[PDB]
Symmetry: none
Subunit: 141 residues, 2 copies
């Protein structure tokens, strides 16, 4: 309940052939959403093939999102939204106000890694890299 | 049922000369009448009270323009997301009320997006400005 969780992610940054392993550390909100944070921690610890270790990032959009742990043409043409207005030209329909927020990237180095990984995506969320980013380790710090 | 437009003044990335590009939108007035009405009203108000003379404050290349602290949020829809932009939309509401109407308009949007940065900070010392707005 008090520990941070981390992902070690293997990926080849944009413009290079060589893979690296970058760490993303997260602060979880176990007090706010105990069952959701608990499930994540449990999935982090399970053996490769049953949890997050050895899973990959399926959809990635630069400067926006990474999706792991598992219309578009219209969104890409330009959507106007009110929240202040926004014009978006990347896939946004997956952002439906129904998510359960359960943590946050903890530090600047981790945030840099997230940005680096996000650069491997595209407006549709399709991963451009040949090397699909893979979680090679996960655990608690 | 009319389309609405913005004429936006900006200098394309890497150039000093400003141009005016038009972005035309189709609004979904039947889906969300009150939201579309508010936008149309603000389009028609005088500068200082409406969109005319307002600027685009945050812009991300190939992704977003926003008008009218870095954080990476972790959320669940075992599927999880790490989101670093428009994070309020994860568990907060946003109302889709329109679309960019045509290819020329889309090209203008793309040009304007190019003036942003990864953080959303506008690179240019002069923000893109809505010089005219109205209905077609």
């Amino acid at each position: 309940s008090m520990s941070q969780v981390f992902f070690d992610v293997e990926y080849a940054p944009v413009g290079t052939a060589e893979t690296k392993v970058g760490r993303i550390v997260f602060n979880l909100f176990d007090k706010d959403v105990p069952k959701t944070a608990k499930n994540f921690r449990e999935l982090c610890k399970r053996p490769a093939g049953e949890g997050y270790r050895e899973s990959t990032f399926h959809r990635i959009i630069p400067n926006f999102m990474i999706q792991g742990g598992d219309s578009r043409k219209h969104d890409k043409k330009g959507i106007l939204s009110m929240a202040q207005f926004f014009i978006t030209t990347a896939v946004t329909s997956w952002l439906d106000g129904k998510h359960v927020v359960f943590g946050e990237v903890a530090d600047e180095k981790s945030y840099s890694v997230v940005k680096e990984i996000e650069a491997l995506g595209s407006s549709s969320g399709s991963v451009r890299s040949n090397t699909r980013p893979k979680i090679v380790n996960c655990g608690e710090l």
